[PDB]
């Protein structure tokens, strides 16, 4: 019984210090928004960074707040032209019986645009 939790945040330059700070900010606001007390509830955490962020692994930031026992994995996001630049995305798999409608997802800094609209698009088909 697992629920994914999405996060997303942006930085203004490709430096290790700004990637670590942003990731820690995003991670901590994600845990607080759902009331996670212990990292033991996380089954794994997955990060994606855009093509223009290469100076540090997000996993390095995770271990700075003591997530050593949490399985971490990072990858490159699809380089879509005109998409929002310099964005760290997070997918945390969470062991919980929380209903999907009740899981809070976090979009910070410029990434508030990536927040999904409940009344958008959709098809007749």
């Amino acid at each position: 019984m697992v629920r994914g939790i999405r996060g997303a945040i942006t930085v203004n330059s490709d430096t290790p210090t700004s990637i670590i700070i942003a990731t820690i900010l995003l991670l901590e606001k994600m845990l607080e928004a759902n009331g996670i007390q212990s990292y033991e509830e996380l089954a794994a955490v997955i990060f994606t960074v855009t093509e223009d962020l290469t100076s540090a692994f997000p996993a390095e930031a995770a271990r700075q707040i003591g997530m050593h026992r949490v399985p971490l994995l990072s990858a490159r996001e699809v380089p879509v032209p005109g998409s929002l630049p310099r964005v760290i995305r997070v997918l945390a798999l969470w062991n919980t019986d929380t209903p999907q409608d009740r899981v809070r997802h976090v979009y910070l800094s410029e990434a508030v645009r990536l927040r999904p609209d409940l009344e958008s698009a959709q098809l007749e088909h």
Binding site: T10, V11, N12, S13, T15, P16, T17, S18, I20, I21, A22, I24, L25, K29, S109, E110
Partner: protein, 171 residues
């Protein structure tokens, strides 16, 4: 030991409506860079000029902070009065800090010219204004900080040691 002041100027955060988040970023950034022992002195206060002046003087002259960093209230809005408070308590100003910070945030955003951020000196204590948003806090701190440990040395303050991998100061 060494003491550094973090001041968040926010009506909303002072009341408890929102989390500081900008101040959390300044503390995170200082926790990187610095490898030497230091104590963070941290307050959240409203957009009230007299209160900011008191808070800066309390940290610089009484609690002996060598460096004080502010976030918030640097724009053209009627309530934003952090820079005015900073010039009141400062004997001497450091125009280079504002000049550089606006030249870096102006590359990406044209509303860097709306910033009134400044920096100055009170006795032996250096005070720098940062903006509200955390992504720009990281860029501004990263621009002006390489000169700060040397600057504190020139004022016979604490020696600040740095993590060469997170940042490299000039001496």
């Amino acid at each position: 030991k060494a003491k550094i002041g973090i001041v968040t100027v926010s009506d909303r955060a002072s009341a408890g409506i929102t989390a500081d988040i900008s101040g959390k970023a300044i503390i995170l950034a200082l926790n990187l860079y610095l490898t030497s022992e230091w104590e963070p002195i941290y307050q959240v206060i409203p957009d009230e000029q007299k209160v900011i002046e008191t808070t800066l003087i309390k940290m610089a002259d009484i609690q002996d902070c060598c460096l004080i960093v502010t976030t918030g209230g640097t724009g053209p809005a009627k309530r934003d009065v952090t820079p005015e408070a900073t010039e009141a308590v400062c004997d001497r100003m450091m125009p280079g800090f504002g000049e550089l910070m606006r030249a870096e945030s102006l590359k990406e955003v044209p509303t860097a010219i709306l910033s009134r951020q400044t920096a100055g000196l009170r006795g032996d204590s250096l005070i720098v204004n940062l903006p509200g948003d955390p992504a720009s806090i990281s860029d501004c701190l990263l621009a002006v900080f390489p000169a700060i440990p040397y600057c504190i040395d020139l004022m016979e303050g604490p020696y600040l040691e740095c993590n060469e991998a997170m940042i490299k100061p000039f001496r």
